[PDB]
């Protein structure tokens, strides 16, 4: 963790985590819980429970690739 944004230590995020690939090349990043619509630039996505977004192409052709956000943010778990 670093300073960017004020988020270190922990950070609570969804359970699914939805990668935009603009162009092939990693763009945005969101997320979602397990079957959760989102939106991403006016074009509503349907994250099913295993983090997988639908439709997983845009009009443009963005690449959308959904994990569970708990391999990615992870957010550390308070034991």
Same mark, same amino acid.
């Given at each position: $963790?670093?300073? +960017? /944004?004020? #988020?270190? $230590?922990?950070?609570?995020?969804? !359970? ?6 603009? !162009?092939? !090349?990693?763009? +945005? ?5 397990? +079957? ?9 996505? #349907?994250? +099913? ?8 192409? /845009?009009? !443009?052709?963005?690449? /959308?690739? $959904? ?6 943010? *992870?957010? *550390?778990?308070?034991?």
């Amino acid at each position: $963790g670093r300073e +960017n /944004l004020y #988020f270190q $230590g922990h950070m609570a995020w969804k !359970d699914c985590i939805i990668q935009r690939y603009k !162009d092939g !090349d990693v763009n +945005n990043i969101y997320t979602a819980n397990r +079957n959760e619509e989102i939106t991403i630039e006016e074009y509503k996505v #349907f994250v +099913n429970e295993a983090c997988h977004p639908y439709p997983v192409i /845009l009009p !443009d052709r963005s690449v /959308l690739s $959904g994990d569970f956000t708990s391999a990615y943010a *992870d957010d *550390d778990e308070s034991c």
